[PDB]
Design a protein around this ligand. Structure first.
Ligand SMILES: *[C@@H]1O[C@H](CO)[C@@H](O[C@@H]2O[C@H](CO)[C@@H](O)[C@H](O[C@@H]3O[C@H](CO[C@H]4O[C@H](CO)[C@@H](O)[C@H](O)[C@@H]4O)[C@@H](O)[C@H](O[C@H]4O[C@H](CO)[C@@H](O)[C@H](O)[C@@H]4O)[C@@H]3O)[C@H]2NC(C)=O)[C@H](O)[C@H]1NC(C)=O
Ligand SMILES: [Ca+2]
Lengths: 5, 70
């Protein structure tokens, strides 16, 4: 997805 | 959306809010004074004037599929 890890 | 404001943080306003998905990265072309961004949903690099006018899109980059920073 686009979340920071 | 990609928003612009005074360096004070006031006058916050959208300048790019059409055809955007996951605008991960931003950059400035100091020579030409043009804002660059990049999408991770549509996988495209775009650039425009600091007002969000004169929007252009770069050509396809071969294997770029999730660009984060530029
Ligand atoms: C998506 O992003 C766009 C911008 O790309 C936003 O649209 C803009 O919303 C702003 C709201 O803060 C406005 O600056 C702007 O809308 C108006 O701009 C007018 C400028 O006057 C000239 O242009 C109009 C164009 O229709 C023309 O008719 C006129 O004759 C002039 O040539 C202002 O006049 C207008 O003022 C009106 O609204 C304000 C409140 O906002 C009142 O206080 C005034 O009394 C008056 O009724 C207004 O400022 C928008 N520009 C565009 C491109 O439409 C969207 O809002 C963003 N949407 C989302 C979902 O994020
Ligand atoms: Ca993708």
């Amino acid at each position: 997805x686009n979340x920071x890890x | 959306k990609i928003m612009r404001a005074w360096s004070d943080g006031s006058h916050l306003m959208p300048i790019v809010n059409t055809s955007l998905g996951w605008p991960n990265g931003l950059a400035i072309d100091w020579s030409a004074s043009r804002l660059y961004w990049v999408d991770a949903f549509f996988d495209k690099i775009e650039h425009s004037t600091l007002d969000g006018l004169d929007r252009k899109r770069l050509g396809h980059v071969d294997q770029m599929t999730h660009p984060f920073g530029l």
